[PDB]
């Protein structure tokens, strides 16, 4: 269940997302439209650097950045799932207690 949920995320977002990952040249630099939408419509409190998006590493090999992300998101969602199932259960509790 969760492994699917993990994998399908990016795929099912792509359709709405691709449009904004089209490239523009701005003042001799490359930007995606998205970056630019951000840059344009000014947020008082949102300096690029706060972002927490991919910025490259030496241990990336490929061409693989999304597949690994999604498989990882899948495998971890297994654990979250369990815990949250049993918490769904704990929250479904009809236990009545005697005093406060």
């Amino acid at each position: 269940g969760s492994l699917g949920w993990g994998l399908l995320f990016y795929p099912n977002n792509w359709p709405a997302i691709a449009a904004f990952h089209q490239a523009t040249e701005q003042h001799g630099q490359l930007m995606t439209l998205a970056d630019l939408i951000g840059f344009h419509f000014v947020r008082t409190s949102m300096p690029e650097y706060i972002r927490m998006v991919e910025r490259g590493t030496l241990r990336t090999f490929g061409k693989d950045v999304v597949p690994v992300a999604a498989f990882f998101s899948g495998f971890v969602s297994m654990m979250v799932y369990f815990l949250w199932w049993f918490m769904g259960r704990w929250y479904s509790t009809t236990k009545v207690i005697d005093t406060i």
């Binding site: 399908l8 795929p11 099912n12 792509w14 359709p15 709405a16 691709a18 449009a19 904004f20 990952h21 089209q22 490239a23 523009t24 040249e25 701005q26 003042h27 001799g28 630099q29 490359l30 930007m31 995606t32 439209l33 998205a34 970056d35 630019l36 939408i37 840059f39 344009h40 419509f41 000014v42 947020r43 008082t44 409190s45 300096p47 690029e48 650097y49 972002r51 998006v53 991919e54 910025r55 490259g56 950045v65």
Partner: protein, 390 residues
């Protein structure tokens, strides 16, 4: 706009703002004003604030009342984070296209990594027109144009709302097909199994098959439109080039040097008295004409006989005086400077008594016979005088 509430001492001992200018204090929707200025990165950068190794230039304004078309600092196009070096000055500018009709108070603004926002000066900027008319636009690498105000929003809804409808079908289906109470009761008794069992599971495997299909389709289509695409472009820009003209603190063969040597401000107040051990160091006689704090200007009306164009608010005409006795060249002189104005109190800089560091910061502006401006940095501990009168 909240600059008033920030800690006084911090505003004074981080970024020193000067020569801030607004192209036009009125624009039409789509008309393209520009805000610019220069900033000196104070030398004794406070502990409270991250090192400005990672910073970001910004237009301080209540949302996108103006689109930003581009901005530059340290002679770089700076839509990403940039390093500022302690002690240097940088020049910047922001290209702002009017968008929303009103009267907005737009600021120069820089944020430091683990520091927060530092707000510069701000000027009211009357915009007129109808927002309806605002466009961008922008040109792709493929050469085509897109109006950003609208581009892509169609395609989004196109994918989002269908699926939300689908999701809502799935719910209302099973709900009205086997109620809540009905199916609770069933389950609560023996069964269950009345509630599900195939071919409820046939419906499921089919609905699922269509979902995945709908995805592989939606993917391959949106992969055909837009078969280019690049990842978000992020990360710290190459080091900036500071200002080298002239001078411009610690730049050039000639310059002024100011030590702070004692201060006192009244509490409550409006007044500050400081003794300044000036050295000069140029080859012209220098009169001190201006002192800037948090974008506040304090002018010697002996030097500023008139009387600059600069938002109220903000701009004082009592940064006085000396004995107008021009000093050098070579001369080393300690000179009592009184700074008095309601703005010092109005801009909560008298609430320096509340701070965990009773310390002043900022730039001093010395002028020659002719125009020539020479800048030196002033800073250090000032003591409060606790006065009566509430």
């Amino acid at each position: 706009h909240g600059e008033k509430s920030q800690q006084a001492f911090l505003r004074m001992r981080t970024l020193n703002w000067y020569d801030v200018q607004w192209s036009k204090t009125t624009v039409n929707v789509n008309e393209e004003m520009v805000l610019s200025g220069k900033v000196h990165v104070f030398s004794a950068w406070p502990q409270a604030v991250a090192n400005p190794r990672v910073s970001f230039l910004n237009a301080g304004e209540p949302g996108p009342v103006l689109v930003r078309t581009a901005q530059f600092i340290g002679e770089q196009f700076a839509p990403r984070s940039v390093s500022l070096e302690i002690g240097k000055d940088y020049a910047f500018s922001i290209n702002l296209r009017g968008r929303r009709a009103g009267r907005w108070h737009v600021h120069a603004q820089i944020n430091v990594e683990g520091g927060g926002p530092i707000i510069g000066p701000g000027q009211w900027i009357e915009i007129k027109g109808d927002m309806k008319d605002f466009t961008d636009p922008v040109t792709l690498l493929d050469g085509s144009t897109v109006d950003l105000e609208h581009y892509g929003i169609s395609r989004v809804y196109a994918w989002h709302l269908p699926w939300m409808a689908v999701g809502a079908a799935w719910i209302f289906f099973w709900f009205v097909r086997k109620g809540i109470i009905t199916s609770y009761i069933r389950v609560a008794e023996g069964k269950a199994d009345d509630v599900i069992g195939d071919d409820d599971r046939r419906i499921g495997a089919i609905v699922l098959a269509l979902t995945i299909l709908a995805t592989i389709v939606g993917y391959a289509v949106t992969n055909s439109t837009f078969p280019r695409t690049i990842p978000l472009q992020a990360g710290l820009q190459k080091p900036l080039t500071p200002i080298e003209t002239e001078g411009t603190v610690g730049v050039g063969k000639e310059n002024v040097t100011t030590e702070l040597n004692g201060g006192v401000y009244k509490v409550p107040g409006r007044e500050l008295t400081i003794n300044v051990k000036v050295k000069n160091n140029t080859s012209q006689p220098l009169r001190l004409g201006e002192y800037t704090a948090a974008g506040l200007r304090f002018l010697n009306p002996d030097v500023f006989t008139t009387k600059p164009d600069f938002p109220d608010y903000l701009l004082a005409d009592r940064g006085l005086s000396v004995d107008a006795t021009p000093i050098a060249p070579g001369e080393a002189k300690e000179i009592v400077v009184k700074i008095q104005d309601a703005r010092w109190d109005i801009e909560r800089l008298s609430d320096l008594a509340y701070d965990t560091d009773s310390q002043i910061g900022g730039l001093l502006f010395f002028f020659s016979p002719d125009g020539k401006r020479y800048a030196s940095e002033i800073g250090g501990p000032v003591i409060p005088k606790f006065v009566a009168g509430d």
